[PDB]
Design a protein around this ligand. Structure first.
Ligand SMILES: C=CC1=C(C)[C@@H](Cc2[nH]c(/C=C3N=C(/C=C4\NC(=O)[C@H](C)[C@H]4CC)C(C)=C\3CCC(=O)O)c(CCC(=O)O)c2C)NC1=O
Ligand SMILES: C=CC1=C(C)[C@@H](Cc2[nH]c(/C=C3N=C(/C=C4\NC(=O)[C@H](C)[C@H]4CC)C(C)=C\3CCC(=O)O)c(CCC(=O)O)c2C)NC1=O
Ligand SMILES: C=CC1=C(C)[C@@H](Cc2[nH]c(/C=C3N=C(/C=C4\NC(=O)[C@H](C)[C@H]4CC)C(C)=C\3CCC(=O)O)c(CCC(=O)O)c2C)NC1=O
Ligand SMILES: C=CC1=C(C)[C@@H](Cc2[nH]c(/C=C3N=C(/C=C4\NC(=O)[C@H](C)[C@H]4CC)C(C)=C\3CCC(=O)O)c(CCC(=O)O)c2C)NC1=O
Ligand SMILES: C=CC1=C(C)[C@@H](Cc2[nH]c(/C=C3N=C(/C=C4\NC(=O)[C@H](C)[C@H]4CC)C(C)=C\3CCC(=O)O)c(CCC(=O)O)c2C)NC1=O
Ligand SMILES: C=CC1=C(C)[C@@H](Cc2[nH]c(/C=C3N=C(/C=C4\NC(=O)[C@H](C)[C@H]4CC)C(C)=C\3CCC(=O)O)c(CCC(=O)O)c2C)NC1=O
Ligand SMILES: C=CC1=C(C)[C@@H](Cc2[nH]c(/C=C3N=C(/C=C4\NC(=O)[C@H](C)[C@H]4CC)C(C)=C\3CCC(=O)O)c(CCC(=O)O)c2C)NC1=O
Ligand SMILES: C=CC1=C(C)[C@@H](Cc2[nH]c(/C=C3N=C(/C=C4\NC(=O)[C@H](C)[C@H]4CC)C(C)=C\3CCC(=O)O)c(CCC(=O)O)c2C)NC1=O
Ligand SMILES: C=CC1=C(C)[C@@H](Cc2[nH]c(/C=C3N=C(/C=C4\NC(=O)[C@H](C)[C@H]4CC)C(C)=C\3CCC(=O)O)c(CCC(=O)O)c2C)NC1=O
Ligand SMILES: CCC1=C(C)/C(=C\C2=NC(=C\c3[nH]c(C[C@H]4NC(=O)C(C)=C4CC)c(C)c3CCC(=O)O)/C(CCC(=O)O)=C2C)NC1=O
Ligand SMILES: CCC1=C(C)[C@@H](CC2=N/C(=C\c3[nH]c(C[C@@H]4NC(=O)C(C)=C4CC)c(C)c3CCC(=O)O)C(CCC(=O)O)=C2C)NC1=O
Ligand SMILES: CCC1=C(C)[C@@H](CC2=N/C(=C\c3[nH]c(C[C@@H]4NC(=O)C(C)=C4CC)c(C)c3CCC(=O)O)C(CCC(=O)O)=C2C)NC1=O
Ligand SMILES: CCC1=C(C)[C@@H](CC2=N/C(=C\c3[nH]c(C[C@@H]4NC(=O)C(C)=C4CC)c(C)c3CCC(=O)O)C(CCC(=O)O)=C2C)NC1=O
Ligand SMILES: CCC1=C(C)[C@@H](CC2=N/C(=C\c3[nH]c(C[C@@H]4NC(=O)C(C)=C4CC)c(C)c3CCC(=O)O)C(CCC(=O)O)=C2C)NC1=O
Lengths: 177, 102, 164, 260, 164, 177, 164, 164
């Protein structure tokens, strides 16, 4: 597992030299952006369970083939594993927001999941739909534009970091697909 | 005699180590100083004359000095104190580097 | 590769739980101590060559029997391997000052070094002589700021306790 | 940690029988080459003997959850079996000894298996993350973790695990496959939960079935003598004659230590 | 009971290694964020009674069927059990604000609550109504310092996600 | 496991009330004393292995019955377990310095060790001697008065914290005895 | 403590079976080679003092830095610790020549020696210098019978490979 | 398949260590006892047919009820299965005399034989009658040397204790 710091260091070991000035400059931008990252993680982790609830309920509510008998959401225990997997995915994405680098998500969760869901018969397109809904809801809570929660923070620019979180969710959506 | 010679060696390897290393740093320093160029005023003084000779006998660089007539050795007659620039300026010398190891 | 980030992320991953407020306080501590650490990293990447030069010169200043006959540096080549190894250890102290934990210094330099050092007949006390010279060598404020000096001492002491 | 003197004999004898089942030839098998450098089995020995004190340092509640759950799962391992019901219920060291003895003579573990392809492997990361979840009931780590106790032991432990996957790559086909069916039986029985699709998962993958253990997640290890020396100057604990499971959990009923 | 201290101490104890510089950075973060948290704890211990009173009053303001016949508070005594439970949860938010992690709130209040609440027919959504009313009611400038308000919101949100 | 914060909380739960003023005041003194605690832990953990080496070699020096054949310090495997245990004890004491409360040392190391060393035949008196040597050397490194290392720090008062560390080592010395 | 007896008895005990003919052939090999080994044990217990004396004297003859003011034998006492350690290693070679396997030499002398030697800052190469001097020292037939000398070389080489 | 070689190599492989002197003594014992064993193997491969013939004839000489009606050899074919099985057991005694341990005799003949013998209603005591006849029959020096016979008796007794 690699944060921003370990990514700078391992890339510097690929160049096989000392860390250098420009890499530290990008790292200073990270540390000055630090409290925005912290408050962003606090936003998503606060509203997390409700994101999972809305995302998976919306996922079923697009196509009722999941809830049809013979669908993969057809029973209580399948639905429990469904909501559980949504919670797990959101957990590792929140880890990727704290770390600043996607290597935690690549190693802990992403590696070997497509062949897993293919082996179980889980429809991967519906999972990518749920990841897309978690992406939209997560950017909405991270930009304080949610219609159900308006938390108060000192105003600033957080669009870059929204692009980071959207990059992680697009990594998951391209990971199962 | 054996035990006490071994007692002797300690208090000396401190100061002897520092003196040797200081000589090496000074060596690099002087060599880079002579390579950067010698100004007119320094070349008039004795130290500049024998440092110019130092550079000549040791093949570090050629330093333009003063022609036997007295007028400064120019390559192009427009500007004073020029030197030939090619293919030896770009070859690195081992006396410039502190680090011989890498 | 341990840092604050990998410790709290690995811990909360082990709980299977979202990162609570305590992890957030820890990483906020990382971004507090980061200024002193990156200062020392900038300065180490400033003068690493003179550091390695005085370190190796003191290393053979203490133990002379290495350069005498036998089972050690008996060439200019092997002394170049010596100064390359001290270049590696200063490069690892640079990396551990960038990361802020002992992670890359441990998993790259420390782990399994003991079988290599007992196998190739390399005595570790010579390294320890070099590092103790460097730690004694750096002043509180002339070389670097005091907060960064402390950080550098900490990392280098960790190397010595790994190696002694 | 100390076990009563009736216990150590019963568990030790049970250990000896499952070692006989696991290796009948007496040419020592592949599964217990223990270590590939010569420092290695010693360091393994010291880590394991120290782990027991780290299990004795757990809070009382967790000890009793271990104890009664080992009792229950040990009876499930008996197959009805009223006599070994009596013997297992009466002696708690011997229960965990019988669990690890059966599972390790049947070659149950993922330490003996090799996953091939991403589907089986992730499945292992899921099952592991269940048990790692079940051990740590908060972000605070448990006291049962203990990879090393000093510096640099942990890296050795890394070398054992990495050196032990290769032996899993080495076993013969016959052995790999007795492992398959045996691991099927260990899962389907030791759970004893008749779902369809669960047994479909165990049908699909014996490596899912390989990682089946107690609800707590860590198999109690068996040690010949917990914290008893080889030196002359051993003080042994003088155990009382009645002993129910809470009494080796809580260590009440020891009294003095008497012997030079 | 999780905090920064027990997380890094438990982690390094699991490694069997001394506490290195990274743990020290983490605890130094704890002693940075401590000022805001203890401010919120002082103020909560200031007006906990009015907080619990408005919380319970809003809790029966939303769901009235509890006080109607049946399988819920049908006495002054059971409504006293109600206000006592909200007293407990505010006391645990106080404790978790003192410690700085979700430790005592989890291991005292959260864990195993679900079997109790499904057993004694206690619907969790009423608690959630109380805490949301409390969360909405808090004003940063009037109630407490803004940094502190964030800490309080975080803890209370944690309660809701534990309970929903 | 309990730090100073958890000790305040659990004592407040014994009183069964809220936290209050005076306990938080003592906690503010802890947090203002925080960097002295950090620097103290950095001092002991820096000089740690050398403390263990001097401590056990000195313990052997006082009485040679341990190194006599039939003693417990006889041979390498025994001596290795001896040095190992010294490292372990020093580690938990350093944990008690970070935590500020002795509960980590009480649960993780102290509980069940006297009975253990009695069972193995380890002489406990000699271990209390080694813990005393670690105490003296540790207070000497923690007050910057060691004759082998003089680290530079801003001068100040740290005697209270020296009394804390001395209290933990006396807890260990009274624990094996 | 490994010998032929403990290997075959431990193996057949691991099978849970009576000792078959192969074990009997092995111990009959032990009672064939026993004559040469016990000859060398008698002679080692003959002149152990001169062996340890020339061993330690060659040990300080090679490395003289050992006697430096800090970090090794800097007393007559520590050189007495040196000669006592070489007394121990010759006593273990005597024991391993009596047993016939590397058992007591391993479990008394070899196991865990490396943490002690890296902790106490004692270089292993000095031991190795002493043992290589002793092995170069003995002629096969003048001092002892030809068969024994081989056995002694084997044991001492095992010490060197344990220690290098 | 146990021999001296597989026991000591499997043991030292289990230690992860090079083969010490004790293993070397054991295999040197194998190459001492090999002469007597291979002598008996040469002579067994000499007259195996008459051995099996007198063995089976004595086997039906003791128990006649096998050849009477019932649940046993009631054909010339099944008595040919009898003489073929005694051919197999003498072939396994030959193999175990070549190897020198009970290895191939165990893993080919002995292991799992008991379920087969209890399943196909084959009484083991008839085999035991045959082998006791062969062991009683052999002379000290008529077809083999005195030392060699002992080896044969040992192997055949092992068969009986495996089968009784
Ligand atoms: C560490 C990461 C990690 C994950 C990401 C999950 C992935 C995962 N999901 C399931 C298993 C499952 N996952 C789902 C989820 C789904 N229900 C649907 O309607 C949707 C298509 C989808 C949610 C978007 C379901 C229903 C099951 C059970 C499938 C079944 O038994 O039929 C399994 C098999 C084991 C089990 O039954 O739990 C695994 C490994 N597990 C992990 O360990
Ligand atoms: C330990 C926990 C912890 C946190 C949760 C954060 C909380 C935090 N955020 C800011 C401060 C801030 N937080 C945000 C965040 C944003 N503003 C927006 O309008 C977006 C909705 C949102 C995107 C993430 C901004 C923009 C600032 C002010 C700019 C800045 O300080 O960089 C500050 C500065 C001090 C202050 O404002 O009083 C702090 C302490 N820091 C911590 O230490
Ligand atoms: C990433 C970190 C990193 C290191 C720290 C080094 C450590 C290291 N050094 C050597 C190898 C070596 N290192 C030295 C150095 C020494 N000469 C002496 O006189 C002194 C005792 C000492 C310098 C102080 C020498 C001489 C060798 C070669 C030894 C030999 O071949 O005999 C080797 C074996 C491979 C090789 O030959 O290069 C390694 C792994 N390598 C790494 O990859
Ligand atoms: C990153 C780590 C790092 C170090 C460890 C130092 C180490 C170091 N110090 C000096 C150089 C020096 N270091 C000192 C320091 C002092 N000498 C005294 O007698 C005082 C006691 C002491 C201050 C307390 C001095 C005075 C010099 C210059 C002259 C000398 O060599 O002593 C030099 C040569 C270059 C120079 O002149 O600056 C180097 C490499 N530099 C670094 O960059
Ligand atoms: C990767 C694949 C994979 C699986 C297939 C599961 C298999 C599995 N199930 C459980 C655990 C469980 N599984 C069930 C399920 C059952 N409830 C019943 O009524 C039925 C008999 C059955 C569904 C058909 C239950 C109830 C538990 C909890 C058992 C208990 O705690 O008593 C556990 C122990 C850990 C836990 O508590 O979650 C595991 C490993 N886990 C995995 O990682
Ligand atoms: C978590 C905390 C923790 C500890 C504090 C130790 C305590 C401890 N020490 C030993 C074991 C031991 N401890 C020592 C130490 C001693 N040698 C002497 O000469 C002195 C009297 C003494 C050092 C001062 C020795 C020699 C052994 C091995 C004893 C033997 O096998 O004879 C054991 C048994 C397991 C083993 O062999 O390692 C345990 C539990 N272990 C732990 O897990
Ligand atoms: C992450 C690692 C880490 C550390 C290692 C400490 C290091 C540290 N110590 C102090 C600061 C200090 N440190 C000490 C310590 C002492 N002074 C004495 O004379 C005694 C010898 C010694 C007893 C322990 C004192 C007295 C101060 C100043 C007083 C104070 O700040 O409380 C400061 C304040 C800032 C500064 O001084 O520039 C810092 C950051 N903090 C950290 O975050
Ligand atoms: C139990 C172990 C044991 C040993 C390892 C030897 C070691 C040993 N050798 C000698 C002594 C000697 N050792 C030798 C042997 C020889 N010198 C040569 O030049 C030849 C190459 C080589 C024969 C192959 C000789 C010649 C002496 C006497 C002179 C000398 O020191 O060389 C002495 C002094 C006493 C004496 O003179 O006998 C000792 C202690 N003795 C022992 O009892
Ligand atoms: C590699 C070693 C090896 C052996 C030693 C044999 C052992 C053996 N014998 C039989 C099987 C048999 N063996 C006998 C022999 C007997 N008839 C009697 O009157 C006597 C009691 C006895 C001879 C002394 C008979 C009769 C059968 C057939 C039994 C039946 O079908 O009823 C079988 C079952 C398969 C079969 O029918 O052939 C086996 C495994 N086979 C092997 O592969
Ligand atoms: C029952 C006697 C016996 C034993 C003890 C045995 C093998 C055995 N298991 C051993 C240990 C061992 N085996 C396992 C795997 C076990 N745990 C699991 O979850 C799975 C499914 C397992 C099935 C046995 C673990 C986790 C360990 C401890 C890890 C460690 O000690 O490194 C060992 C010790 C040496 C080693 O590290 O491999 C040995 C030698 N084979 C046997 O027949
Ligand atoms: C009738 C069946 C039905 C539903 C159920 C919803 C489900 C739903 N929520 C969405 C998306 C969505 N949902 C929420 C979360 C949610 N909003 C909040 O402000 C709070 C507090 C929440 C939890 C209580 C957010 C924050 C978004 C992002 C849009 C937004 O800004 O509100 C989206 C848009 C998906 C997309 O962008 O692709 C859908 C479909 N829609 C339906 O048609
Ligand atoms: C309590 C923690 C613990 C362990 C785990 C063991 C591990 C262990 N096995 C050893 C050594 C060892 N182990 C085996 C293999 C093993 N024995 C068999 O007969 C069969 C069938 C085996 C695999 C199932 C053999 C064959 C030996 C050699 C000793 C012997 O003859 O039995 C040795 C001695 C190492 C040495 O000589 O340096 C150790 C330490 N010891 C411990 O303290
Ligand atoms: C493939 C062979 C192999 C292993 C076996 C592991 C062993 C291992 N565990 C570690 C370290 C380690 N181990 C645990 C304990 C463990 N984790 C938990 O969350 C729970 C519940 C546990 C017991 C079940 C913890 C808590 C850590 C500290 C790292 C972390 O935060 O997880 C470390 C790091 C050591 C260090 O930091 O120097 C290693 C090498 N690694 C390997 O390569
Ligand atoms: C002859 C057998 C023998 C020994 C071995 C020593 C061992 C020893 N060290 C002590 C104590 C001691 N030891 C050290 C550590 C040590 N000093 C340093 O400056 C450095 C760099 C060290 C590691 C290399 C310190 C720092 C102290 C505290 C005293 C001091 O200020 O030096 C004390 C005092 C114990 C006490 O106060 O109760 C003793 C007995 N004494 C003996 O009689």
């Amino acid at each position: 597992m690699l944060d921003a710091f370990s990514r700078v260091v391992v890339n510097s070991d690929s160049k096989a030299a000392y860390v250098g000035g420009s890499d530290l400059q990008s790292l200073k931008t990270f540390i000055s952006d630090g409290n925005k990252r912290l408050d962003a993680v606090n936003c998503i982790v606060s509203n997390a369970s409700c994101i999972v609830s809305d995302a998976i309920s919306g996922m079923i509510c697009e196509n009722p083939g999941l809830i049809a008998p013979g669908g993969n959401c057809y029973t209580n225990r399948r639905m429990a594993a469904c909501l559980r997997d949504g919670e797990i995915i959101l957990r590792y994405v929140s880890y990727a927001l704290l770390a600043g680098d996607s290597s935690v998500l690549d190693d802990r969760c992403l590696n070997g999941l497509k062949e897993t869901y293919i082996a179980l018969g889980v429809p991967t397109a519906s999972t990518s739909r749920a990841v897309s809904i978690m992406k939209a809801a997560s950017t909405a809570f991270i930009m304080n534009t949610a219609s159900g929660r308006k938390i108060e923070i000192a105003a600033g620019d957080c669009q870059a970091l929204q692009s980071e979180a959207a990059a992680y969710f697009d990594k998951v959506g391209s990971a199962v697909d | 005699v054996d035990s006490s010679f071994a007692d002797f060696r300690s208090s000396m390897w401190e100061s002897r180590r520092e003196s040797l290393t200081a000589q090496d740093f000074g060596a690099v320093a002087r060599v880079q100083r002579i390579k950067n160029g010698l100004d007119e005023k320094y070349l008039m003084t004795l130290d500049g004359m024998l440092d110019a000779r130092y550079a000549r006998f040791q093949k570090i660089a050629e330093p333009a000095v003063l022609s036997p007539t007295g007028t400064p050795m120019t390559e192009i007659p427009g500007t004073p104190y020029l030197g030939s620039v090619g293919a030896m300026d770009f070859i690195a010398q081992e006396e410039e580097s502190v680090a011989f190891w890498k | 590769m341990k840092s604050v980030i990998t410790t709290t992320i690995s811990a909360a991953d082990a709980a299977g739980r979202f990162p609570s407020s305590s992890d957030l306080e820890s990483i906020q501590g990382n971004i507090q101590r980061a200024s002193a650490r990156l200062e020392a990293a900038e300065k180490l990447s400033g003068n690493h060559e003179a550091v390695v030069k005085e370190a190796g010169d003191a290393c053979f200043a203490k133990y002379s029997y290495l350069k005498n006959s036998g089972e050690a540096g008996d060439s200019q080549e092997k002394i170049n391997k010596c100064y390359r190894d001290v270049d590696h250890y200063m490069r690892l102290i640079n990396y551990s000052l960038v990361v802020g934990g002992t992670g890359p210094l441990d998993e790259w330099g420390i782990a399994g070094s003991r079988e290599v050092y007992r196998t190739l007949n390399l005595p570790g006390s010579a390294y320890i002589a070099s590092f103790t010279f460097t730690r004694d060598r750096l002043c509180v404020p002339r070389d670097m700021s005091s907060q960064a000096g402390v950080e550098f001492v900490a990392a280098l002491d960790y190397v010595i306790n790994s190696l002694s | 940690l100390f076990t009563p003197p009736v216990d150590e004999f019963m568990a030790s004898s049970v250990q000896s029988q499952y070692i006989q089942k696991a290796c009948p030839s007496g040419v020592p098998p592949i599964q217990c080459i223990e270590g590939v450098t010569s420092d290695q089995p010693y360091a393994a020995r010291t880590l394991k003997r120290q782990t027991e004190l780290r299990y004795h340092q757990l809070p009382v509640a967790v000890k009793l959850r271990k104890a009664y759950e080992t009792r229950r799962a040990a009876v499930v391992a008996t197959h009805g079996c009223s006599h070994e019901e009596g013997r297992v219920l009466s002696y708690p060291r011997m229960a965990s000894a019988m669990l690890i003895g059966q599972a390790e003579a049947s070659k149950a573990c993922s330490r003996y298996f090799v996953p091939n392809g991403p589907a089986e492997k992730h499945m292992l990361q899921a099952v592991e993350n269940r048990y790692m979840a079940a051990v740590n009931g908060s972000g605070v780590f448990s006291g049962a973790c203990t990879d090393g106790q000093t510096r640099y032991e942990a890296y050795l432990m890394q070398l054992r695990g990495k050196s032990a996957e290769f032996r899993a790559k080495q076993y013969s086909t016959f052995e790999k496959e007795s492992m398959k069916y045996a691991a099927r039986k260990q899962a389907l029985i030791q759970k004893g939960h008749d779902c369809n699709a669960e047994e479909v998962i165990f049908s699909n993958y014996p490596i899912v079935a390989s990682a089946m253990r107690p609800t707590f997640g860590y198999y109690t290890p068996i040690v010949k003598n917990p914290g008893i020396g080889s030196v002359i100057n051993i003080m042994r604990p003088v155990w009382d004659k009645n002993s129910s499971i809470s009494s080796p959990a809580t260590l009440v009923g020891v009294g003095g230590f008497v012997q030079p």
